[PDB]
Amino acid sequence: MFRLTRLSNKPILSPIKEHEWEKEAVFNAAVIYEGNKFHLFYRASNNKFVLNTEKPEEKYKFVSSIGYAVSEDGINFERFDKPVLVGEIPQEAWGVEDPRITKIDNKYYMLYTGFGGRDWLDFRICMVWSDDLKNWKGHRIVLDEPNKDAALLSEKINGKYVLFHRRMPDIWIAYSDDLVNWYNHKIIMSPKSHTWESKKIGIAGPPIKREDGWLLIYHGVDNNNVYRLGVALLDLKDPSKVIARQKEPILEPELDWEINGLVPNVVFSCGAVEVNDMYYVYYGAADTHIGVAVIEKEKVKF
């Protein structure tokens, strides 16, 4: 088995109480590595996360925003006073969550969860895109259904866009001619009962192309809602086929700010990039902080 190794025993991004939109939490962050820079797009919450109510209650409302941070070494990030993305329509009344960014041809696609807070199924995969990672346009509901953990493949298979999504509790794949209509939905990977990944699974960041397949980092949730990261390999030509899947996780809550926090016992990645023959996996921790762990790509064997 292989596993990620943290670069810091402390977060690389933490909430800023002076900033309302990231007052309580910064986590679950998309990343792409473009101009020799790490472009990090992080979920941020103005509030703690009451989840145990029958419906989302306005008195316990939290608002998710996406922030931007940039770094050259992967560790130290420059941050900004304001978020780059917020919810603007009622379906995103409780904000925009867990972004995954994929570059296809020469455009960047950010897939996030729009949460409206009207009930606990009131969340949708949404998409905006940009030429430049700065000006997001063309907001759309990707699937009109309670769904999340969505990512696009960085290229087309047989001329089709590929979407990973997550009809509970499985990782699903779907295909599109036009990034509008999705078809040939199917389950590509399922939880394993009586294990750390028993309750549900979902893609982590967008799959990373390798020579032996597409690297599929994913999160698994156990019966007590611990989020841990696992890893699987998709067939290179047919990313609907899992060709390998590591039995044990590659990241689990270990440090205090991963075990303890707003949502205890969570590590969760929305983004990972290949940089200098290493995979940089940025992860939310306890839905409160962002850490980063790496693995030399040479060590990724199944």
The token pair that represents 197 in the structure block:
């990944």
The correct pick among 77, 115, 136, 164 for binding ligand MAN (CB under 6 A) is 115
In whole angstroms, how far apart are CA 181 and each of 142, 148, 187, 188, 253?
8, 17, 18, 19, 37
* Nearest distance from C-beta of residue 291 to a copy of itself, angstroms: 16
In whole angstroms, how far apart are CA 261 and each of 8, 106, 199, 250, 288?
17, 38, 21, 21, 6
The reply to whether 51 sits near ligand MAN by the rule CB under 6 A is: yes
Interacting residue ranges for Zn ion, rule: CB under 5 A: 81, 92, 114, 126, 149, 170, 190, 193, 202, 248, 254
Stretch that binds a copy of itself, among 67-75, 192-200, 209-217, 275-283 (CB under 8 A): 192-200
The correct pick among 113, 147, 240, 288 for binding ligand MAN (CB under 6 A) is 113
8 or 225, CB closer to a copy of itself? 225
The correct pick among 153, 265, 268, 290 for binding a copy of itself (CB under 8 A) is 265
**Under 8 Å CB-to-CB from 256, ≥6 apart: which residues?**
none
Measured between alpha carbons, how far is 223 from 71 in angstroms, rounded to an integer?
36
- Picked from ligand MAN, a copy of itself, Zn ion, none, the partner binding residue 114 (CB below 5 to 8 A depending on kind) is Zn ion
Each residue 83-122 as x (binds a copy of itself by CB under 8 A) or -, in order, gives -----------------------------------xx-xx
- Picked from ligand MAN, a copy of itself, Zn ion, none, the partner binding residue 202 (CB below 5 to 8 A depending on kind) is Zn ion
- Picked from Zn ion, a copy of itself, ligand MAN, none, the partner binding residue 126 (CB below 5 to 8 A depending on kind) is Zn ion
- Picked from Zn ion, ligand MAN, a copy of itself, none, the partner binding residue 97 (CB below 5 to 8 A depending on kind) is ligand MAN
**Under 8 Å CB-to-CB from 219, ≥6 apart: which residues?**
149, 201, 202, 204, 227, 228, 229, 230, 267, 268, 269
Instruction: Provide the CB-side half-sphere exposure for 121 (13 A, CA).
Output: 5
Q: Which of 102, 191, 94, 83 is nearest to 142 (CA)?
A: 102
The correct pick among 79, 167, 209, 297 for binding a copy of itself (CB under 8 A) is 167
146 or 278, CB closer to a copy of itself? 146
- Binding region for a copy of itself (CB under 8 A): 48, 50-54, 57, 59-60, 118-119, 121-122, 144-147, 167-170, 177, 181-187, 190-191, 193-194, 196, 200, 223-226, 252-253, 256, 259-261, 264-265
Residues at the contact surface with ligand MAN, assessed by CB under 6 A:
49, 51, 97, 113, 115, 123, 148
